[PDB]
Symmetry: D2
Subunit: 120 residues, 4 copies
């Protein structure tokens, strides 16, 4: 089994902590990004998500509410286990910027990927 | 002020209901999709997300844990208000499928958009 | 049969003109975007793409080499025809910005959608 | 400088050849994917794209017309050079499937990433 609970780092150097996953697969956590539009502003930021509970290699999603900008990121992915019991989170994300009005909506969404492994 | 609490529909005919947004911008809800890989299986499914609280046109994200498949979707976007006080959510999404192992990860993520307006 | 040759506009007000499609499904064209990072710089820009030839509702892709910035956009989608012979292109796109070095790669890709209908 | 001309492999094991880039940045090539929806059907497939010509680390895009399915993929990205002169293509892609009619359009687009390095 592949619980999200724990500490994780990604390929950019970001650090994420996921707390207890409840019986509905819901979880809270924190996220310290290594990169940002204005990296001097970075602070620890909250996340909230849901994973599938029963699956051995569950899919999941979470939202990061950045505390230092008007942006939001969502991540979705799957937790995989090796033959050796090593876990990897393979994810993709959408990063939504705040724009002034609906005419700028077209430019407000960035896309990318991240792989996470456990810190311990 | 552009608020998420209430009932919404999107351009595909899906319905979502978001409950009270707390002081941290967190919300729960339910999502009834009009479409699926197997539309005969569709059931009402829970969501969990976060919005920015203070912005008049906030960005937000949420995760939908589909109750009828192993997939997960995340939505992110922004709530816009026009002259008349009419609200629209402009969103993009990632839909993560469950695959058997990490060698299939490349095909596991679909992307799309949705616009939502209030229902009743 | 759903063909790409001709003039089109999308939901943002951009105009594109596609020339003759050859026997391999290749086409050239021009693209006039209604929006940009710096809309004061916009100029008419070339495109190059490929469609499937034999399908009645073909999928296709094309690249737009913006003549006024260091960015590139790719569009992919499908041409649909309804009962009346009315054609619509449903597309998604990736807009790649130029960044200074590989450490900024994570922020370099925006995503979005466009629907196109014929002009004249 | 970072010409696309040459042979490249990606992180999935796919092989791509890009032929001469003309004075407008346009190029043809071939692509042998290591993976597919139906990998038993895979055959060598054509691509067509454009890169920026003058930039030392150009952005670019290309379209792959798959010869063995009704799908199309577009790739966009940037060519980066190391301090040692080693080139890497960092890309993202959209893979468009053919669907029967417009009501299924929502499910027709997959997204992902690939990094390429030179074969020689
Ligand atoms: O720049 C901002 O306003 C908020 C921080 C965004 C950080 C993004 S989220 C996707 C990518 N993966 C990370 O670990 N960090 C970046
Ligand atoms: O097919 C599944 O396994 C779960 C349902 C997926 C529904 C998607 S989520 C994105 C798009 N927007 C909708 O309202 N429904 C579809
Ligand atoms: O801003 C730039 O540097 C180049 C212009 C980008 C225009 C984008 S491409 C996607 C979207 N669809 C359009 O018709 N225009 C925008
Ligand atoms: O499955 C198909 O019908 C066509 C082949 C798709 C292969 C995709 S394109 C994106 C990804 N990167 C690759 O090198 N191959 C896959
Ligand atoms: C991400 O994956 C790459 C390629 O497998 C690997 O080299 C790297 O260690 C991974 N990063 C993390 C934090 O897991
Ligand atoms: C973020 O960075 C910008 C540019 O330095 C600064 O002016 C702004 O006040 C910062 N905002 C926050 C929330 O830290
Ligand atoms: C979505 O936007 C379209 C295009 O503007 C509009 O016609 C429609 O009313 C919107 N649909 C919903 C359900 O909000
Ligand atoms: C969904 O649909 C498939 C195909 O009809 C069916 O076999 C399966 O049992 C259904 N799964 C669930 C959990 O609803
Ligand atoms: C795009 O689709 C919308 C929503 O159906 C429609 O109202 C509009 O006519 C289309 N726009 C263009 C320019 O094709
Ligand atoms: C585009 O706009 C910027 C900002 O106004 C300007 O400085 C620059 O010269 C322009 N670039 C080109 C090549 O059009
Ligand atoms: C892709 O990048 C990863 C991480 O840097 C690297 O280990 C791998 O060798 C690269 N693959 C190719 C084909 O360049
Ligand atoms: C692709 O694979 C399927 C499933 O094996 C097969 O039935 C079909 O004929 C193949 N199509 C092509 C174009 O090779």
């Amino acid at each position: 089994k592949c619980s999200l609970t724990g500490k994780w780092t990604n390929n950019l150097g970001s650090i994420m902590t996921i707390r207890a996953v409840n019986s509905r697969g819901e979880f809270t956590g924190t996220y310290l990004t290594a990169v940002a539009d204005n990296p001097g502003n970075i602070t620890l930021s909250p996340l909230l998500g849901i994973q599938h509970k029963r699956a051995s290699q569950p899919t999941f999603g979470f939202t990061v509410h950045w505390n230092f900008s008007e942006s939001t990121t969502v991540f979705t992915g799957q937790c995989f286990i090796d033959r050796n019991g090593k876990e990897v989170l393979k994810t993709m994300w959408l990063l939504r910027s705040s724009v002034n009005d609906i005419s700028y909506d077209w430019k407000a969404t960035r896309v990318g990927y991240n792989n996470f492994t456990r810190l311990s």
